[PDB]
Design an enzyme around this catalytic site. Sequence first.
Site, mmCIF file in Angstrom:
data_model
loop_
_atom_site.group_PDB
_atom_site.id
_atom_site.type_symbol
_atom_site.label_atom_id
_atom_site.label_comp_id
_atom_site.label_asym_id
_atom_site.label_seq_id
_atom_site.Cartn_x
_atom_site.Cartn_y
_atom_site.Cartn_z
ATOM 1 N N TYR A 160 40.998 34.867 34.851
ATOM 2 C CA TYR A 160 40.055 34.325 35.835
ATOM 3 C C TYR A 160 39.170 33.248 35.217
ATOM 4 C CZ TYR A 160 40.840 37.386 39.804
ATOM 5 O OH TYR A 160 41.395 37.996 40.892
ATOM 6 N N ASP A 283 50.593 49.779 35.292
ATOM 7 C CA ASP A 283 51.609 50.020 36.327
ATOM 8 C C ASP A 283 51.635 51.503 36.689
ATOM 9 O OD1 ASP A 283 52.548 50.442 33.699
ATOM 10 O OD2 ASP A 283 54.601 49.974 34.239
ATOM 11 N N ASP A 307 41.044 43.557 40.337
ATOM 12 C CA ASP A 307 41.266 42.915 41.640
ATOM 13 C C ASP A 307 42.358 43.722 42.382
ATOM 14 O OD1 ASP A 307 41.127 40.739 43.581
ATOM 15 O OD2 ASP A 307 43.074 40.086 42.802
#
EC number: 1.1.1.42
Lengths: 416, 416
Positions: A160, A283, A307
């Site tokens: 980001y 994951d 996010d």
Amino acid sequence: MESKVVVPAQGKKITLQNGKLNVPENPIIPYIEGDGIGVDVTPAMLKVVDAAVEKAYKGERKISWMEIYTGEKSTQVYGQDVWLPAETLDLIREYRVAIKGPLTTPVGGGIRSLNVALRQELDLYICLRPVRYYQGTPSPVKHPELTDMVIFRENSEDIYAGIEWKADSADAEKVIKFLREEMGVKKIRFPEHCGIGIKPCSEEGTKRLVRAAIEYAIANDRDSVTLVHKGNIMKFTEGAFKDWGYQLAREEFGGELIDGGPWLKVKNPNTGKEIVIKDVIADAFLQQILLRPAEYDVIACMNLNGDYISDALAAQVGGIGIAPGANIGDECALFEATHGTAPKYAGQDKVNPGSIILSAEMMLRHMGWTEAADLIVKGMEGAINAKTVTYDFERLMDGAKLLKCSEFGDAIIENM
Amino acid sequence: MESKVVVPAQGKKITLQNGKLNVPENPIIPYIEGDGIGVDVTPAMLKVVDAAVEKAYKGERKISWMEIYTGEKSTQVYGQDVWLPAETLDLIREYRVAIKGPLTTPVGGGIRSLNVALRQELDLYICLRPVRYYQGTPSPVKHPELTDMVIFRENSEDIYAGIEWKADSADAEKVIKFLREEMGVKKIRFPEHCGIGIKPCSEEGTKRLVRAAIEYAIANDRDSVTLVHKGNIMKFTEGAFKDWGYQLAREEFGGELIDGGPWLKVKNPNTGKEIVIKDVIADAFLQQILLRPAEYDVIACMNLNGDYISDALAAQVGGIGIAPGANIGDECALFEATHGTAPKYAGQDKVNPGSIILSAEMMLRHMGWTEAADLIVKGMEGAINAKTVTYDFERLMDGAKLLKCSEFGDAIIENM
Ligand SMILES: [Mg+2]
Ligand SMILES: [Mg+2]
């Protein structure tokens, strides 16, 4: 051009002394209306918050709202291309606490996310997204009630940072040349017509985020803090985040090994409870929140994973449109509607104001006005249980009474 | 040291001519047993596959299995530190089609993922993970049957390239100096004690992955191809992937604008069906697969997002332990159990062999032996519907008959 912001006649500015907020009984609170449906949800939020405050403190306290700008309305107020005025950044930092509706960034002008801009410009390094289930909310999963987590998403670094170069650009070539020639990099599969992005993760950025997460678990008597990362592939950024997070637990909070590791126990200095510090590969975590949600509580993770995680969790509890969020730093805080601007419905008074209203709940709580905050949660719980909801909920259920956006705000008040 | 691999006496090597597999009736198929529970699941897979092949082709066809090595067993066979012999890479490429149980990478030796190693060394750029629901599977969601997707995850680039430097290392400092001083980078929040990772995305890497995804949708008459990315934040890598994917649809498949965009329609040249090419931002997608799963089909995405998406989808259909996967390139393919090695249960004959067995189904289908592949799917469907399952399923249901790993393989055969 002169500021178009009007400082409230009555109202006093919140101050900060020794890292603690000093909130008057008449605080001035800046608020950004928000683009699109912000036009619908913000008024509902203003009304609900004033009611909760009025009801909790019998008129002794009152927020003096001050409108500030960012987004499309800002270009409307300050002129073409003023999407984020410097004065808005100044005002949020000055008044310490603010709230905003949804915002969208224009495309075609090389402008980066305005939401991210606010976060980074103000060094609001904690993106705090609590996710719980509200009884009566139509959910895609069988047991949404098992979900009660709080996400601490690092907000100042990771990919980001916005450091990247376009494929075939001279800079990208310059960067790739450097990588292959000076760094000896041989791992770029296709070095031509190749875009490049940089992902930073630092010890200080990681520790200030995790420190906030552990303090929150202590302050709220939560059961565990889970470090979520993909450190098995990204050893020096994601794996470093995990390592530095466990190191901080050990160095500053007396964390000690559980069994043979790798988990640690941190004793709550106020309840004597032992808080578990553990970690899960990203994951696998997206599977674990669905399969064993009861085993997770406070989550500490990097920007991008946060996010994803906050979005996945909100969806599963049926809270895609009522998920609260806050961006908190050491000098100020900005609470926010977490959904999009939904321009197709804008001005129609039909969307769910629940997200910005629960962000306001977090805001009030942040100000130490917990009684007012508890009234909003109580109102939200009764309105939803009453099945007196907006279309997004109603359409998914049977026996619901459909309400407008404005009417749902009233229902929340009617249920305080 | 001499190869410890024994080439089967009977058996013939598969060849490739004009990008098409030429499979004998007696193909030699290399297989890696796998660490931990690979010891349980591989034998079950070998037996199930031989049965399906025997049953479909009445003895006319037969696979000549050849054991090859990678992982802990490889160190056992070839010696200390031989985790991935060069000969295994040579053999997979030579014999064109292979399958493997789960593998784990040792920690403490600076060795990167052996699974990723295989993928990258062999240029198996497509990680193909189909996710569907098997009636009778205990699932955390209310409507798992609505999920029927196929994930095309780019396997050769993205942050998986393994290009990174440790915080405080001389190289990391060298890289950061370059970035700030020569590239003029000012976006690194904390340049000290900062780890750095590089994320590449190229036009060629992106287009070969998306080309495979669109060809698959055409070949299988699927309804749409969704480009999943976080291009709003990562403009030059993730946004480039999305842009290049739509461009390829237009340039090579005659994609044309639907309404006012941004979606495209590609006509199936065999069914005349119009395949929709669309895109969804990654965080929102993790919400959409739960909330409107019926609207998605074939998914094309980058390496990391695909890692997350395939995990999230498998969990939701109750398929965390029976999810098939393949790594496919232009010269060879490697099918794989997609779960971990679960050493605690290894050798106990108790875990679910369903994942490696359905990967074998994909393998047989890849070889054009679709009748054998259909028999495995039929067997898997009847065993699960029969509620004659392994503990991982049984423990989540009522009225199930608990079976050992080996016995579940039999149940699959009993149901062909
Ligand atoms: Mg998001
Ligand atoms: Mg994975």
